Amino acid sequence: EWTVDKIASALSVLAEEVPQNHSRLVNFLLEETEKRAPQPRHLSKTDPFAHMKSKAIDPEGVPTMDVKFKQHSGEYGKSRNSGRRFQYPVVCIKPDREPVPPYRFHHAEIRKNILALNSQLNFVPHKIQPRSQKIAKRAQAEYAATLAPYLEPWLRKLNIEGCTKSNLIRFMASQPESDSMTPQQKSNLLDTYSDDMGSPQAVRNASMFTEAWDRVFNDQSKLRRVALRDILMLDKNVEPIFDNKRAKALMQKVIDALGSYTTLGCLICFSHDCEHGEIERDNQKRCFSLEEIGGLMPSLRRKWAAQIEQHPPCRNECYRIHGTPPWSENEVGTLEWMFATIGYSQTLRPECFVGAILGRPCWDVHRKLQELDLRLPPVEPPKQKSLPWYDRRKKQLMSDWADATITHEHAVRELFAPCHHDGPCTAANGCPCASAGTHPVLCERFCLCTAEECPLKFTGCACHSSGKTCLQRQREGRPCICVQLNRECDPTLCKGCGARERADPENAYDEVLHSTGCQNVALQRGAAKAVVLGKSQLEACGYGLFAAEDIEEGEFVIEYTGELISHDEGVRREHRRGDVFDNKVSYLFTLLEQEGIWVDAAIYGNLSRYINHATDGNIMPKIMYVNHEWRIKFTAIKDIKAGEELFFNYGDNFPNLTKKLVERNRPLLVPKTTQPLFDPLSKVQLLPGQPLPQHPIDDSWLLLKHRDNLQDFIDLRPEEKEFLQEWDAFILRRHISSEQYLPRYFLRFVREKADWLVSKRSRGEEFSKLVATLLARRVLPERVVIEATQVLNDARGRLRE
């Protein structure tokens, strides 16, 4: 019969092996390291100093320094005498090079803004954790890690009924201290462990072990102490329950099957881990995804309604020819979600595609479809006054539109989820576009309303010209509504101005194309003027940026890229970089003032971060709405010649956040210049007339971060992670912001990965779920699902050898 005294006594004797094992380990490692001492390498065969004698003077015009030597002997180090001083000649050597201008951190280029996570204020140069709780919790964590591997062998040796790691976990869960645990966490503990702890003596023994352990190892006087509970929380089956990295009739099956894609699939760039969405205070992320606009059903139901309001046979034994191996439920689920998602289509049917996804003949799936008799839910079959300040058919603003809407006023906007209600976009119906702000904003492309239904629905500009158009001062009579709204043209909606071609980065350097047509897609085009880093002409500035080619007034120059951060992250960063203890050393570009988004180029950004302040600048920043991203462009306001330094008026663009918080109580050549110029990476000085360095952007570190973000979801199965990561790694490199270019990149993906996708069943399965999600959104044309069927049947055919 055990007592707390007897268990505590026994744990104390077992605990004696802990310092014994440790001494043995340290001694083992030291002995191993002694044996591994390295032999000296790269020795010269001759002593290189052999010919050099003492330079002590026994000189004329040579600088001299003194040295005083003392000699010592004995055990206490007593001097032999008071010392002897000697004079030595000095060899004076100057350096042959100046340092480059100063900087902190390694400055790396990003193609587009990246989304940061919130950090912890753990270090300030000189909410912070008191160093006392810092030291103490670290001490306890090290001791707990030391003791954890002893618990099971000790329990084995004690062999007390009910003193099981499992039963000690159940006892812990039942105690009142569980003051550290939440609903659903209990359910998952009870899913794995339940609450039955055995016989009464088993429950009694577990209680006395817990008490006895906490007495021996959790003495409150000591710094290194550990509660049994802290050991048990380290357990591999307990820890995931307290890990908060979670991603997430006929239609409930399909809703559940597509949930990873509807939850993580970005509506803008189509990646499942990307730079869009919202980061909450604890770094949980709300993705800018289908779930943001009501999940799959409101969009899918509308696809149905549009379908009910409206080629060759496949090379896989097409059911159009025939129509007739046990089907897995996964295989049946695959046919279910493809069927539901194809919907009431005329041009496309699931059998062929499902047949290419599965390794099955087309007539097989049709025969299985026919016996399944799948039936879609039935879908049920209002006049609204146009607004006096906006006509969406003529694509024109009029009257007091600048007083009627805040559509164009990015500094006051708040980022609500796009419309997904059922009725007209009015205050009565809870539409945030009409009523969430001080003024109505236009409904954008992700709102579920159509331009036919909704007087707030943005429909693009009407501009067209064989010459240049969509210009700031449009000498075409009617202005460009896109320009007026401080937004770039949409490649899909602005059909007349050629934005479809000019916003395509694959045409970025077609100077013929961009010499006419839309001049309002420069951020999407992605081409910057040639610029070169150098030492600024301004004294007390360090680096500056110089034109490396001539720039005419009104041309786009460069984008201000960087990390997107919250207000509080900006405050934390100002502290961490020493800016709060003053002289400004931290520059946070205000992107959306009211929403609280800043752009931070301290580490990641581009050469625009080096442009210096001048009240009379030659370029001008402007915040633009760019297909539901907000971005900062610079436009020349003077003619600028190659070799001249760029400047803009910083104005109020870089607020001190903590201060305002505290207050609330023709090849491209290096140009000729006077200033030294530098390669941004090597910091080698550049020479005029040499080729200008243009280094391709290094993005593989960023792809790794996004891949690992997906790997961290406890919520996702290995098969899901594998496909999501494969698609993301491909699609993030295309930097998509318009659905206009998705079909091209989708078909390139299916072709490059065709052998990979048919090599493993779950890959085609997961690929079909993506396809189903993009079809339900009506963002993937039917024609490319048809083509993808041929690509996969071909690859599967090429594999059978």
**In the block, which residue shows the tokens 């270019």?**
741
Of 232, 279, 790, 353, whose CA–CA distance to 567 is shortest? 279
Please tell me the distance from the alpha carbon of residue 703 to that of residue 733, in angstroms, as a whole number.
Answer: 8
Q: Using the minimum distance from each CB to another protein, give the nearer residue, 157 or 798.
A: 157
Q: How far is the CB of 161 from another protein (least distance, A)?
A: 23
Q: Which is nearer to another protein, 247 or 791 (CB)?
A: 247
Is-contact 260 254, C-beta < 8 A? no
Nearest one of 459, 509, 483 to 668, comparing CA atoms:
509
- CA nearest 483: which of 351, 625, 652? 625
CB of residue 117 to another protein, shortest distance in Å:
5
Residue 184: left (phi > 0), alpha (psi -120 to 50), or beta?
left
Which residue among 163, 290, 480, 732 contacts Zn ion (CB under 5 A)? 480
Nearest to 769 by CA among 341, 401, 396, 144: 341
- What is the distance between the alpha carbons of residues 656 and 654, in angstroms, rounded to a whole number? 7
Buried/exposed 314-341: b ≥16 CB within 10 Å, e otherwise? bebebbeeeeeeebeeebebbbbbbbbb
Confirm or deny that 287 is annotated as ligand binding: no
Pick from Zn ion, another protein, none: which does 375 bind, CB < 5 to 8 A by kind? none
| Window contacting Zn ion (CB under 5 A); options: 160-168, 189-197, 452-460, 722-730 | 452-460
Considering only 161, 235, 291, 549, the residue that binds another protein (CB under 8 A) is 235
- CA triplet 687, 691, 697: central angle to 5 degrees? 110
Site string for another protein, 31-70 (x = CB under 8 A): xxxx-xxxxxxxxxxxxxxxxxxxxx------x-xxxxxx
Cα torsion 771, 777, 778, 784 to 10°: value is: -20
Closer to another protein by CB, 615 or 694: give it.
694
Which residue among 5, 177, 195, 239 contacts another protein (CB under 8 A)? 239
Minimum CB distance to another protein smaller for 127 or for 311: 127
Give CA–CA dist 225/227, Å, rounded.
Answer: 7
Contact map string, positions 476 to 515, toward another protein, x by CB under 8 A: ----------------------------------------
Our CB check for Zn ion shows the closer of 363 and 634 to be: 363
541 is in an annotated binding site: no
- Tell whether 431 is in a known binding site: yes
Rounded Cα–Cα distance for residues 334 and 254 (Å)? 9
157, 185, 533, 584, 611 from 601: Cα distances, Å: 59, 40, 15, 15, 12
Instruction: Select the residue interacting with Zn ion from 10, 163, 296, 456 (CB under 5 A).
Output: 456
**Binding window for another protein (CB under 8 A); candidates: 118-126, 169-177, 412-420, 749-757:** 118-126
Stretch binding another protein (CB under 8 A), from 130-138, 174-182, 433-441, 667-675: 130-138
Pick between residue 350 and residue 671 the one whose CB is nearest to Zn ion: 350
Residue 102 CB, nearest distance to another protein (Å)?
5
482 is in an annotated binding site: yes
CB of 579 to Zn ion, least distance (A): 31
Q: Decide: residue 788, CB within 10 A, 0-12 exposed, 13-18 middle, 19+ buried.
A: buried
Taking each helix axis from N to C terminus, what angle separates 782-799 and 742-752, rounded to the nearest 10 degrees? 10
94 binds another protein (CB under 8 A): yes
> In whole angstroms, what is the distance from residue 62 CA to residue 69 CA?
22
Taking the least distance from each CB to another protein, the nearer of 543 and 625 is 543
Cα 624 to Cα 126, 518, 531, 634, 672, distances in angstroms: 39, 16, 22, 10, 34
Interacting partner of 135 out of another protein, Zn ion, none (Cβ under 5 to 8 A depending on kind): another protein
d(CA 627, CA 239): 41
Residue 261 and residue 770 in contact, taking contact as beta carbons nearer than 8 Å? yes
Residue 119 interacting with another protein (CB under 8 A): yes
Instruction: State the alpha helices, DSSP H only, in 96-247.
Output: 131-147, 151-158, 165-174, 185-192, 200-217, 228-233
- Cβ pair 616, 545 in contact under 8 A: no
Total of chain residues touching Zn ion, rule CB under 5 A: 29
DSSP state of 443: B
- The footprint of another protein on this chain (CB under 8 A) covers a number of residues equal to 115
Q: How far apart are CA 333 and CA 358, in angstroms?
A: 11
Q: Which of 799, 736, 735, 732 is nearest to 764 (CA)?
A: 799
Nearer to another protein (CB atom), residue 220 or residue 700 = 700
Please give the DSSP secondary-structure letter assigned to residue 455: T
Q: Does 121 sit near another protein (CB under 8 A)?
A: no
Between vectors from CA 416 to CA 409 and to CA 244, what angle results, nearest 5°? 135
Judged by CB under 5 A, does residue 269 bind Zn ion?
A: yes
Near another protein in 708-747, by CB under 8 A: 708-709, 711-712
Binding positions for Zn ion, 326-365, rule CB under 5 A? 352, 362
Within 302-321, which residues bind Zn ion (CB under 5 A)?
Answer: 314, 318
Return the number of the residue (181 or 234) whose C-beta is nearest another protein. Answer: 234
Q: Which of 4, 15, 108, 436 binds another protein (CB under 8 A)?
A: 108
Q: Select from 164-172, 491-499, 542-550, 699-707 the region that touches Zn ion (CB under 5 A).
A: 491-499
Between residue 676 and residue 695, which ones bind another protein under the rule CB under 8 A?
A: 679, 681-684, 693, 695
Q: Nearer Cβ to another protein, position 17 or 256? A: 17
Residue 509 CB, shortest distance to Zn ion, in Å, is: 19
The residue (of 201 and 284) whose beta carbon lies closer to another protein is 284
- Rounded-to-integer distance, Cα 709 and Cα 525, Å: 29
Contacts of 499 (CB under 8 A, 6+ apart): 470, 489, 490, 491, 517, 518, 520, 521
d(CA 209, CA 168): 8
Q: State the binding partner of 352 from Zn ion, another protein, none, CB within 5 to 8 A by kind.
A: Zn ion
Q: Residues 163, 300, 338, 461: which binds Zn ion (CB under 5 A)?
A: 461
From candidates 3, 9, 122, 328, binder to another protein by CB under 8 A: 122
Minimum CB distance to another protein, residue 30 (Å): 6
Among residues 167, 213, 202, the alpha carbon closest in space to that of 14 is found at: 213
Please give the Cα distance from 431 to 419 (Å, whole number): 6
Residue 318 known to bind ligand: yes
Nearer to another protein, 103 or 416 (CB): 103
Phi/psi region, residue 252 (left: phi>0; alpha: psi -120 to 50; beta: rest), is alpha
**Least spacing, CB of residue 245 vs another protein, in Å:** 8
Q: Annotated binding residue at 92?
A: no
Of 85 and 311, which CB lies nearer to another protein in the complex structure? 85
Residue with tokens 């897995």: 328
Site for Zn ion in 576-595 (CB under 5 A): none
8 A C-beta contact, residue 525 and residue 492: no
* CA atoms of 368 and 370, how far apart (whole Å): 5
The reply, when asked if residue 330 is annotated as ligand binding, is: no
Binding residues for S-adenosyl-L-methionine: 543, 584, 586-587, 612-613, 658
Binding residues: 266, 269, 274, 276, 314, 318, 352, 362, 419, 421, 425, 431, 433, 443, 447, 449, 454, 461, 463, 470, 480, 482, 489, 494, 497, 518, 543, 584, 586-587, 612-613, 658-659
Interface residues with Zn ion (CB under 5 A) are 266, 268-269, 274, 276, 314, 318, 352, 362, 419, 425, 431, 433, 443, 447, 449, 454, 456, 461, 463, 470, 480, 482, 489, 494, 497, 499, 518, 520
Binding residues for Zn(2+): 266, 269, 274, 276, 314, 318, 352, 362, 419, 421, 425, 431, 433, 443, 447, 449, 454, 461, 463, 470, 480, 482, 489, 494, 497, 518
Binding residues for S-adenosyl-L-homocysteine: 543, 584, 586-587, 613, 659
